DNA sequence: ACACGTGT
DNA sequence: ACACGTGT
Ligand SMILES: *C(=O)c1nc2ccccc2cc1O
């Protein structure tokens with residue numbers, strides 16, 4: 001759920 | 009059980 | 017070495 005490198 | 013990678 | 021959780 002978070003996006004810090006991908007954002008799922 | 010499956011779904012994540014770029015940005016220091 | 018540190019930096020992540022919402023949504024099926
Ligand atoms: C988002 O909350 C979240 N995203 C994920 C992406 C890929 C793998 C695990 C994973 C867990 C969570 O909680």
Ligand SMILES: *C(=O)c1nc2ccccc2cc1O
Pocket residue numbers: 004005006013014019020
């Ligand atoms: C992004 O590429 C990315 N983000 C993260 C966030 C939190 C923890 C690990 C992590 C690894 C990567 O690759």
